[PDB]
Design a protein around this ligand. Structure first.
Ligand code: A5A
Ligand code: A5A
Lengths: 336, 332
């Protein structure tokens, strides 16, 4: 494709602006928040704390307007190179009418996070055409204790700071965990589980990658903030800390919307703490029942989700997925 | 095309499009059947009755087959879900919409069954009914079951002249007791419908369970919301964070630029996350002072008793004076 506007690569010493578009984690998990800030500051970055840092409004950090103001102040700040959510929740989609998309277009930045922040990552991409990044959120990702934080950090740097020739291979982490331990304070080492990606349905696909947190997508679907899925796209989806009933509903939502008629392939994230409801079924098994007799190449248990460690994935650029050989390559530039 | 009114001596077919309640809550199930049998309706038990597949009654295919057998049965005049859950939307590609259109019947239920009520209406243009599901609604103990049943007759069985006035119950309950077995009387909560934003509106009513709508939005099974429609929405047993997301989902989809009025159901067991905010207040924040007539705490949701509401027909609402009238025929 033609060259297009892209955000500048991260540099050592850059300022990362943090915001809380949903849950008030900087108030309710202060130890993990301070540890995450300290992790990035020790690496040499600066943190600009958004205006709702340390505030509390129960399930959220502040009103819809206050949250949009917090993010906009970062978007408008020429000194901020990267805008990172603190954590998700459920309420990022409330901000969408109020975001200064023109200011973001004027001065594109690296916009990164995951989970509920998908509303914003996809909304900015839909409105501006600037790739956004499914990747670390400050508290969950950078407040993780060693060792996994260091793997997350390495992938973050490799994708956002280092020069990469194309095609850029996204390597499989060697070890992983989803254990529900060590949130504020560490009580034992997480298990270093040997990692694998899963060749659910063989084949290859090449196309623009679209997606993120599937549950969250259902809060933006049909609006101007959801990029339209096009023939040949590769669908990236993950859910975390849900159950079999919920994810069947979301998979059937995609099916009845025709999404599976369009896409060339599917990348499915690991599903942190999945509740199978007694079925013993894996998330991909439920998805494949919904697919019925339609064969689609599918690579599952991809490490770009709430499990540790986490890959940083550009969204809105061409990718090659090889479900048979379990490879993912980025084929188009995502930063300058 | 309209369905025929229910009559005493008719057969109600029951199906389980999601949770396997006929297996998991057998006392309430049996009570519900017995209530309707004594009133004078036969019950035809769908093919998944008594089956168990964990969070669901059976496979996608088996659930579609269960419902289709009822659609295709000329002896059935009313098709009623047993209960909701999460997974009715899985059936939508597989339903025999043409058989339904060719021989319309009363389709009733609530909650997750919204996917099917709206899908049937979208595909066939035949009104469907937001109203009782067998086990939650008719397995309720006295007193509230009796009022739900009165409402059910008023919409489905009685010869009703237009306009059809939908009247507020005197008392309600959302109390989390007396599911399988009765232990105490439910407290009688005095009722009020709430004039949140004054005004009047007349238009086609569209909606149901809001959480469930997000599982069918954008598909051929979601009827297009049109300028002037009245939006009927409820959520049940959720929290402030969930409903903010759902209200904002409507907002960014332009729904509030189209609709002439909103009817908001009560919110059973609402978890306000410590905020002391009501559901309507969260909707008001989302609306940002856009003046849309809004009548809240409407009794067509998971609270008891329940109104049976036609969907897809013209309605007149007065939020100020707390009235709802159905203006267009919904049955023969
Ligand atoms: C905070 C909000 N309810 C939430 O779950 N946000 S989130 O989905 O973005 O959280 C990301 C991940 O952080 C972790 N997490 C969030 N809050 C947690 C807590 N209080 N304790 C343990 N893990 C938590 C889980 O891995 C979760 O999937
Ligand atoms: C069964 C499925 N998880 C569910 O909640 N289905 S439903 O949303 O349609 O349920 C309708 C209503 O039945 C009631 N309910 C369902 N299962 C129940 C149970 N096991 N105990 C108490 N009430 C229940 C609640 O009023 C609920 O809002």
């Amino acid at each position: 494709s033609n060259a297009m506007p892209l955000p500048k690569s991260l540099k050592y010493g850059d300022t990362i602006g943090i915001y809380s578009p949903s849950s008030p984690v900087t108030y309710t998990s202060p130890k993990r928040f301070e540890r995450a800030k300290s992790y990035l500051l020790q690496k040499g970055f600066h943190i600009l704390e958004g205006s709702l840092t340390g505030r509390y409004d129960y399930y959220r950090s502040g009103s819809i307007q206050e949250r949009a103001k917090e993010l906009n102040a970062l978007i408008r700040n020429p000194n901020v190179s990267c805008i990172m959510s603190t954590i998700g929740g459920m309420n990022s989609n409330s901000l969408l009418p109020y975001i200064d998309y023109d200011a973001f277009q004027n001065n594109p930045k690296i916009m990164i996070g995951y989970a509920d922040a998908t509303a914003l990552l996809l909304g900015i991409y839909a409105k501006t055409g600037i790739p956004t990044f499914y990747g670390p959120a400050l508290v969950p990702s950078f407040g993780e204790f060693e060792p996994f934080v260091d793997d997350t950090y390495k992938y973050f740097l490799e994708t956002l700071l280092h020069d990469q020739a194309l095609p850029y291979n996204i390597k499989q982490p060697l070890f992983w965990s989803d254990e529900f331990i060590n949130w504020e304070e560490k009580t034992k080492e997480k298990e270093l589980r040997p990692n694998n990606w899963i060749s659910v349905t063989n084949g290859q696909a090449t196309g623009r990658v679209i997606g993120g947190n599937l549950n969250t997508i259902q809060g933006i679907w049909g609006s101007p903030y959801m990029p339209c899925i096009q023939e040949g796209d590769i669908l990236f989806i993950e859910d975390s800390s849900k159950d079999a009933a919920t994810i069947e509903r979301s998979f059937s939502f995609l099916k009845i919307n025709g999404v599976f008629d369009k896409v060339s392939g599917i990348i499915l994230g690991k599903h942190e703490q999945f509740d199978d409801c007694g079925t013993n079924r894996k998330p991909y098994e439920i998805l494949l029942e919904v697919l019925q007799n339609q064969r689609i190449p599918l690579l599952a248990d991809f490490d770009c989700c709430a499990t540790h460690p986490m890959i940083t994935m550009p969204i809105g650029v061409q990718v090659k997925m090889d479900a048979t050989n379990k490879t993912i390559h980025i084929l188009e530039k995502w930063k300058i």
